[model samples]
Structure formats: C-alpha cells, structure tokens
Target: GSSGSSGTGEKPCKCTECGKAFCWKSQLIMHQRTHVDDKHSGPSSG
Candidate 1:
C-alpha cells in the first residue's frame, strides 16, 4: 500500500492508549517511541 499511495492524503494511525489518531502511520510509529523513550524513527525525518 505504501508503494501505491502518493502520501498526499492522511493515514490515520489510531493510538491504543488515548485513541488519538496520527497524520500518518509513520507518524504513529515515531510516536510509539515515547512509550519507552526509545528511538523508533519512522519513514519520515525528525
């Protein structure tokens, strides 16, 4: 799906903790890092 998607629209990544949706899956992946203060960089840059 990543290959086809133009990344122009939104990709909601629902947070299990607060149900807060992210702008993109990659954004959520990066946010997951806060769970343990560990580095979990996603496809997007910091």
Candidate 2:
C-alpha cells in the first residue's frame, strides 16, 4: 500500500527517453506514444 511513489496528479504527463521528451494525462487522458518504438503509458481509469 505504501511502496510506490505518490503524486499530486495535477500536472500534465511528461518524460524523456534517452534524450527526448514526452507528455501524458489523467484517466480521461489516457494517451500514448509509439512513434519512436518506445512510448510512455499515460493513465487508466481503473
């Protein structure tokens, strides 16, 4: 229950792969990116 990191879940999703960048969202914004063969999973309602 208290193992994973916690967040405010308020800001837009964003990350970097190797040397690039990314962006994601919340339950309603479960977006994804697979253009570079590598992508970050946004969010899930469940």
Q: Number of the top candidate by TM-score?
A: 1
TM-score result, candidate 1:
0.42
**Which one is best on lDDT?**
1
Lowest lDDT sum, 10 consecutive residues, model 2, at: 19-28
Q: Residue by residue across 6-25, what tens digits does model 2's lDDT show?
A: 65544354443333333344
Error of 2 at 38 (Å): 5.2
